[PDB]
Amino acid sequence: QECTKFKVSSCRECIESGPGCTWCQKLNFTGPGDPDSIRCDTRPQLLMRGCAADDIMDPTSLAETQEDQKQLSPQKVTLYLRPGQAAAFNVTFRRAKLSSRVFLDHNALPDTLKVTYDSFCSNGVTHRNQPRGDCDGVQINVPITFQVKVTATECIQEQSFVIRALGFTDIVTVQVLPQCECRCRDQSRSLCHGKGFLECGICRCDTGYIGKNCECQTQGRSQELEGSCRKDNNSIICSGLGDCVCGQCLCHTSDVPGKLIYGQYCECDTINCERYNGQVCGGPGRGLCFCGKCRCHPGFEGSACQHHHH
Ligand SMILES: *[C@@H]1O[C@H](CO)[C@@H](O)[C@H](O)[C@H]1NC(C)=O
Numbered sequence: 001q002e003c004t005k006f007k008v009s010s011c012r013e014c015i016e017s018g019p020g021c022t023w024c025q026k027l028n029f030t031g032p033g034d035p036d037s038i039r040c041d042t043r044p045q046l047l048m049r050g051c052a053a054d055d056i057m058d059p060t061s062l063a064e065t066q067e068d069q070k071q072l073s074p075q076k077v078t079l080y081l082r083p084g085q086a087a088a089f090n091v092t093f094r095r096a097k098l099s100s101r102v103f104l105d106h107n108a109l110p111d112t113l114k115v116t117y118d119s120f121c122s123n124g125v126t127h128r129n130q131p132r133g134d135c136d137g138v139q140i141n142v143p144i145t146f147q148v149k150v151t152a153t154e155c156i157q158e159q160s161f162v163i164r165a166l167g168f169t170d171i172v173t174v175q176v177l178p179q180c181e182c183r184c185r186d187q188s189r190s191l192c193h194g195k196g197f198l199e200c201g202i203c204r205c206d207t208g209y210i211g212k213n214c215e216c217q218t219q220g221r222s223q224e225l226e227g228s229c230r231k232d233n234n235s236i237i238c239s240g241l242g243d244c245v246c247g248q249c250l251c252h253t254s255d256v257p258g259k260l261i262y263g264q265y266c267e268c269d270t271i272n273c274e275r276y277n278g279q280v281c282g283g284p285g286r287g288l289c290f291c292g293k294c295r296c297h298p299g300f301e302g303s304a305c306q307h308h309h310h
């Protein structure tokens, strides 16, 4: 269908994003370089890319009826509203005395809730998707049916509204509940470094901490300073000799005696300088190797500190 995504960092934020979004919850759906939002997509896309329908979260709006008298039915309904997905239910009007005109209406609703009505009236008249239910001349014990469709545009909290026929003292009490949370089978307590707990196959990091395994603690800005894991915009990461950790290069450790890989982009080491008399920079008695330049001790000169002032 259509699932518009990016911002999406939880299964709930995914389901909030739009009715066509679903969420893959198995943790080996993703690799290190992928953003969390790749778990949020239409059902075909995630199926196509190897997520098991067993593992695809997709809560749906639904209606739940309860006969709890004579004229309007039912009198209690409970709707779970996934944002952007209508929940529909039917109300039946029936009178033993003859009815003149049936106006189905609701009381004041918030901005976030919308109600429309189909009216299936007696003797071949149907109205569709109107703001109020409307039928003319209902007869003795002859039912008419209104289909009520309720849509939320965001996650609401528990609340109720009433549907009434004007001039009649029965009501339909509509309890409305959010359908935004995912149902995820999750461990309690490695994988988030004690700085988050797991939810639907991703880490949910404590206040102050970020990263997919909650490995970084937040700084004022950053980790959009990962461009500063590349020496320039079209270079590899940390000169191919380190890894970007929290937007900073952590350089590879080394086998070699006296060698250290260092620098903002791991571009330097302590052994690749000009040699003389067998040792780098002429040995420790003459100079020290720093990122390809020999820093000679006082008394020695030359690019490899060969010349004790010659
Ligand atoms: C991911 O791991 C589960 C076991 O928890 C396994 O059933 C599944 O096949 C794995 N995914 C792939 C793509 O192999």
Ligand SMILES: *[C@@H]1O[C@H](CO)[C@@H](O)[C@H](O)[C@H]1NC(C)=O
Binding pocket: 088, 089, 090, 120, 145, 146, 147
């Ligand atoms: C309500 O009744 C109509 C027939 O009058 C039917 O087409 C529709 O599917 C019903 N709605 C529900 C939610 O059962």
